[PDB]
Symmetry: C2
């Protein structure tokens, strides 16, 4: 084969982000380590226009669904999209603040994964927690995956960020992964992917950047057999 067959070796991956936020175009390149059976992987990403013009927090999701660990019995869409690869459209709407809108595309490089991304960030508060970099932590979460028509899936998530003064900035994440190819592909039934993420600027680098860790795995949930028995 195959699709998930391709993913049984250890893996590297490459991320070319080409973003902007309220005007300031920037470029971010990152590259990647994920060891079979995946589920746990770290990213080094380097801001190539020197300094990043806003927080690195909201970048987390931008910097690899195929690397989530799936149990047998839940079909691994993101992995089955290969080799044809997949695209992603995604909005994240932060309350009383801005909206990221990414478009990602992905290509397999026999055992590498090239990821090429546009992201616009607009209507954002320049005085707010993302620009003033008042974003303390990134709450873990149970993202919801749903079958989206014949060749895609949808990922819905609430992304929690803790504010300087110990509040909460809530983001609404709506993301659609679509298979590029023409052949048939199984759309898994409704499930979840748990995503746990830790971020930080690798203190030994002259150029703005960060290291990032993510644990991410799929599960389903109980079924009820009857409403009395």
């Amino acid at each position: 084969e195959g699709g998930p067959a391709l993913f049984q070796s250890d893996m590297t991956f490459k991320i070319f982000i080409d973003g902007e936020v309220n005007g300031q175009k920037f470029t971010i390149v990152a590259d990647g380590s994920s060891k079979f059976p995946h589920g746990d992987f770290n990213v080094h990403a380097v801001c190539e226009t020197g300094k990043l013009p806003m927080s690195w927090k909201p970048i987390c999701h931008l910097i690899e669904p195929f690397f989530a660990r799936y149990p047998d019995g839940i079909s691994h869409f993101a992995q089955e999209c290969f080799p044809e690869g997949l695209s992603i459209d995604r909005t994240v709407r932060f309350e009383n603040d801005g909206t990221m809108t990414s478009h990602h595309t992905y290509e397999l490089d026999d055992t590498c994964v090239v990821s090429r991304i546009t992201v616009n960030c607009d209507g954002f508060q320049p005085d707010g927690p993302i620009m003033r970099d008042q974003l303390v932590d990134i709450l873990p979460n149970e993202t919801h995956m749903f079958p989206h028509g014949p060749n895609a899936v949808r990922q819905l998530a609430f992304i929690g960020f803790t504010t300087a003064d110990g509040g909460l900035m809530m983001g609404h994440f709506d993301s659609k992964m679509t298979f590029n190819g023409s052949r048939a592909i199984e759309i898994p039934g409704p499930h979840f992917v748990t995503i746990i993420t830790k971020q930080m600027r690798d203190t030994s680098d002259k150029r703005d950047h960060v290291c990032q860790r993510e644990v991410a795995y799929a599960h389903s949930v109980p079924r009820i057999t009857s409403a009395i028995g």
Copy 2:
């Protein structure tokens, strides 16, 4: 504060819902039971105005967060809420359909929680799957519970329902649970409550009713410390 002490016995509950949908009033009354350790309780619901004019499925979250089994280490906020009690303001925005707005008060009467709810459902598509009773089941979810101000927690969820043509009706659920008391109560950290829900008709009760079983348990997700391993 001695609220969780109270819930250490087997309780009952009674619910009065005053509803309207597309300008047509309806009333639902419910009762049920939740034996310690709780988290798997059932409710018998009856429409007091004859025939309900919409699917029963979307009524599910209306007919008891204090009956979610928590584990130690997470404050079980809806339980700390007594003896005083708690209220909920909840909105469910359905994709391309209407909104359900509800206000709930909860009172404890010895070992009975009495619930009083007014809900308004507006802008619902008359030929839609909700008004045409074409919802077929309810998808299990992972609500996300966040602490909110000094007196409240916020609950956020994707509540989906399978329609009869096997598509998906998706609700954006946003709920604020407020402590009615003037003391200070412990505001738990960000966690989750998993909810599984199933409805069935008891064929002995000739009235318009549902029996609804719910499995609900809170859990939190371990927060990675090393950005390494």
